[PDB]
Amino acid sequence: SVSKTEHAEINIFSVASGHLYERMLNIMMASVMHHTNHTVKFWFIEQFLSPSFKDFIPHMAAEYGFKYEMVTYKWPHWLRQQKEKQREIWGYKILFLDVLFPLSLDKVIFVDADQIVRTDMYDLVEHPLDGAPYGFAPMCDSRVEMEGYRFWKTGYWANYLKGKPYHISALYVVDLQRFRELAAGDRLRQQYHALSADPNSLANLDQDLPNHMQFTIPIATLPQEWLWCETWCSDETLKDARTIDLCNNPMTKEPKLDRARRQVPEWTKYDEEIAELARRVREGTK
């Protein structure tokens, strides 16, 4: 209850780098705000954001009625670094959950910058984790034509998981109090440091690490409805989706903005609403 007052009832963090992902990140935030009356605070990994995004965020905050905080955490020199920017961004999603946020924040949800929310995110805040420090949705099996690309259903992963789900990292709820109690952050950092000695390991860093650790750092498998991606999930389950991820389709290679406009009817309305807000701020400041 002290976390709800000092911060907000719903706390979401995301990571974005590049104009395309920042444009989608504003849309993700507008989609959250249109679907809840609970208080919201957005948390941003500052060093990857553009100066324009950081200058526009107080205008988004005042227009949509949310609070926000910029977090700048320095990668520890002992911890194996990532030379690829994409892999460093993935490290920021999963390696520092216990230290990016203040001790007074009890719970935080990661929501991908390219996501569209169609639900009250307070329902995820209230989802029962039963002592798991975090919850992720599983990868869908419902789009049968994509079975050849489900790498987690054959080879190394099928033998390692033994039927346990392979989870997607586009969305996850973190009970920070339980995550801290279980020292999950220190354990993920130490395991990542040891596993990353092999440069071929953790190809999908943010996703492979929690899935590899799920027999010792439990994952509360979220209802499949919490994350729908066309690449893996059936058309028929879209009407039940609480959130949508615009995940890459290895078969079609369709561009990101084309996937957004084709799959999500309300995407253009959020995009035009934020562009109208940008034009209004441009005249008021210039």
Ligand X SMILES: *[C@@H]1O[C@H](CO)[C@@H](O[C@@H]2O[C@H](CO)[C@@H](O)[C@H](O)[C@H]2NC(C)=O)[C@H](O)[C@H]1NC(C)=O
Binding residues for Ca(2+): 112, 114, 245-246
Which CB, 36 or 201, lies closer to ligand X? 36
Q: How far is the CB of 273 from ligand X (least distance, A)?
A: 17
CB of 245 to ligand X, least distance (A): 21
Dihedral sign, Cα of residue 2, residue 175, residue 76, residue 67: negative
- Which C-beta is closer to ligand X: that of 10 or that of 246? 10
C-alpha dihedral sign at 10, 35, 233, 19: negative
Listed in order, strand segments (DSSP E) in the chain are 10-14, 40-45, 67-71, 107-111, 116-117, 134-138, 167-175, 219-221, 243-244
Q: Order of strands across the sheet with 107-111?
A: 67-71, 40-45, 10-14, 107-111, 167-175, 134-138, 219-221
- Kindly write out the interface string for residues 86-125 of this chain, putting x where it contacts Ca ion by CB under 5 A and - elsewhere: --------------------------x-x-----------
Answer whether 177's CB lies under 8 Å from 133's CB.
Answer: no
Q: Which residue has the tokens 């009890």?
A: 106
Nearer to ligand UPG (CB atom), residue 39 or residue 234:
234
Which residues form the interface with ligand X (CB under 6 A)? 35-37, 120
Contact 259, 249 (CB under 8 A): yes
User: Is 206 within 8 Å of 95 (Cβ atoms)?
Assistant: no
37 binds, among ligand UPG, ligand X, Ca ion, none (CB under 5 to 8 A by kind): ligand X
Collapse the DSSP code of 113 into the 3-class scheme (helix H, G, I; strand E, B; otherwise coil) and give the result.
Answer: coil
Strands 40-45 and 10-14: parallel
Q: State in angstroms the smallest separation of the CB of 139 from ligand UPG.
A: 10
Q: Which stretch binds Ca ion (CB under 5 A): 34-42, 103-111, 124-132, 242-250?
A: 242-250
Question: Residue 234 phi/psi, 5° resolution?
Answer: -70, 150
- In whole angstroms, the minimum distance from the beta carbon of 40 to ligand X comes to 12
Contact partner, 36, from ligand X, ligand UPG, Ca ion, none, Cβ < 5-8 Å per class: ligand X
- Closest CB to Ca ion among residues 8, 113: 113
Per the annotation, binding residues for UDP-alpha-D-glucose are 17, 21, 86, 90, 93, 112, 206, 245, 248, 256
Bridge partners for 117 per DSSP: 243
Query: Binding site for UDP: what residues are annotated?
Result: 17, 21, 248, 256
Sites of contact with ligand UPG (CB under 6 A): 15-18, 21, 86, 89-90, 112-114, 169-170, 204, 206-207, 245-248
Residue type, 155: G
Site residues, Ca ion (CB under 5 A): 112, 114, 170, 245
